[PDB]
A = this chain, B = another copy of it.
Amino acid sequence: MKGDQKVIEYLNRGLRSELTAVSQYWLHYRMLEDWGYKDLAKKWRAESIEEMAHADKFVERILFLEGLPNLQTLDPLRIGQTVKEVLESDLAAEREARALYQEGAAYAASVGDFPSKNLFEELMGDEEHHIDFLETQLDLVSKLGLELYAQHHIGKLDD
């Protein structure tokens, strides 16, 4: 069905945001695993897979609206080299995603593309849940210190 070109543009900007989140969370999952925080690594793997679903939803909507999904590039990655830097890096990216979806939802509503508006509003609520999670971890690092926070999430050793 031919879609509004500017909505398609916002969907492709959202696709690039999600592809950045997928790789930034996956690399941070494998860095947390390499550092030995196996329970933090488990959660970051699961968050990267949640963003993979979001990327797919954008690809599907762009094709339905007869646009061309662009998966060639990502937004710049932010790679942390301590557990606190990983939390901070992912929080900054997720704030930028939320603001993009707020703008995409308002734009789509202004042209009557309510199903696209509802996809951006659904993803904006999911990114505020990711933000809540990341802010909470940084709250614990502030109140307990980074070493008590991270030690709690080392996890179990493999068989």
Contacts and interface: CB of A to CB of B under 8 A. Distances in A.
Interface of A: 1, 19, 23-24, 26-27, 30-31, 33-36, 39-40, 42-43, 46, 56, 59-60, 63-64, 68-69, 71-74, 76-77, 79, 82, 95, 102, 105-106, 112, 114-115, 118, 120-121, 124-125, 128, 131-133, 135-137, 139-140, 143-145, 147-154, 156-159
- The number of times this chain is found in the oligomer is 11
Contact of A144 (B23, B42, B147, B158): B147
A1 B34 contact: no
A112 B121 contact: no
A116 to B, nearest CB: 9
A139 B140 CA distance: 22
B150 A30 contact: no
Contacts of A76: 72
A62 B72 CA distance: 23
A144 to B, nearest CB: 5
Contacts of A42: 157
Given A34-B136, A124-B114, A139-B36, A26 B56 contact: yes
A77 B69 contact: no
Contact of A150 (B23, B36, B95, B144): B144
A135 to B, nearest CB: 7
A35 B136 contact: yes
A1 B132 contact: yes
A149 B66 CA distance: 22
A88 to B, nearest CB: 15
